[model samples]
Target: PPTLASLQRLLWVRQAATLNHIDEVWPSLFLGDAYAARDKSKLIQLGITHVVNAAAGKFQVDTGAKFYRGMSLEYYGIEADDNPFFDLSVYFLPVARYIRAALSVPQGRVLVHCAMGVSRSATLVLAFLMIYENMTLVEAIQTVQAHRNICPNSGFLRQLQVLDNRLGR
Candidate 1:
């Protein structure tokens, strides 16, 4: 198994495309920047029914449930910071469950977004895959990176390492 340092180093070595406004990082799960999150028409076009705002706050994207008013959308928000010291692990399982449940609905599709779709949102999606899809941290990073570039902070990577150890990866 790869240690946290090895995994982080591996992440830096992988090549990936620069992010578009949004990309479908996983089936029924889109990873996007703040611009894509505010584009209500685009969300409808993609049939996005669930929104997970990893950087949810007045200073951040700030698009709560009310932002999708009159649209057939469900919303989940996390007031998170992209700083390396932030305690994002506290949100891992809850956001994972929310993503899982959203995808469980009929015709369900979800969009997970943060400021850049690189750190905060990507970290949550990685957590979801590990918890529900039985992927190790390394596996989850490869899967997501195959489609979209993602770089969770050093702190978030360490937290995921803890998860991997707890789950016996």
Candidate 2:
């Protein structure tokens, strides 16, 4: 079972760890920040086929479909906030399904990103692993943390707890 305290503890355990612009937390699935999101050359270098912009508003990391117009990749953007009060769960299932669908393609190298990539993008990726991979919240967190240090907000963790409760281990 994944208590809030346990999840919080796991996040803190990686608090001081160094993080880069992006990391592959799962096979062909990347978790990154705004810097990685806008790096067209690097994205092209990595052969990224799809991009999920968790921060999509003009005030946020607003890279739209036109950003990759010349490229052969797809784009999905969500104007998500980093605040704990923000309701990010609404897009959990939808993003997970989108990621799932993208990965089915032969060249599916998807990148999920937000401003800092620690909260919003990480939360959605965790939800994807839990919802589609059938892993518990703890397993999902541990899985991603091993590759990249992630810290979803308290409210998002609460939402994920609701998901974990509904899905069960």
What are the lDDT figures for the candidates, one per model?
0.89, 0.92
Q: Would you estimate the TM-scores of all the predictions?
A: 0.95, 0.96
Top candidate, metric lDDT: 2
Best by TM-score: 2
Candidate 1 lDDT score at position 26: 82
lDDT assessment of candidate 1: 0.89
Cα shift from native, residue 142, model 1 (Å):
0.3
lDDT of 2 by residue, 107-135 (tens): 99999999888889999999999999988
Candidate 2, residue 135: CA error in Å?
A: 0.8
Give one clash count per candidate, in the order shown. Answer: 0, 0
- Candidate 2 residue-wise lDDT at 60: 87
The reply for model 1, stretches above 4 Å from the true place, is none
How far is 130's C-alpha from truth in model 2 (Å)? 0.2
RMSD (CA, Å), each prediction = 1.2, 1.2
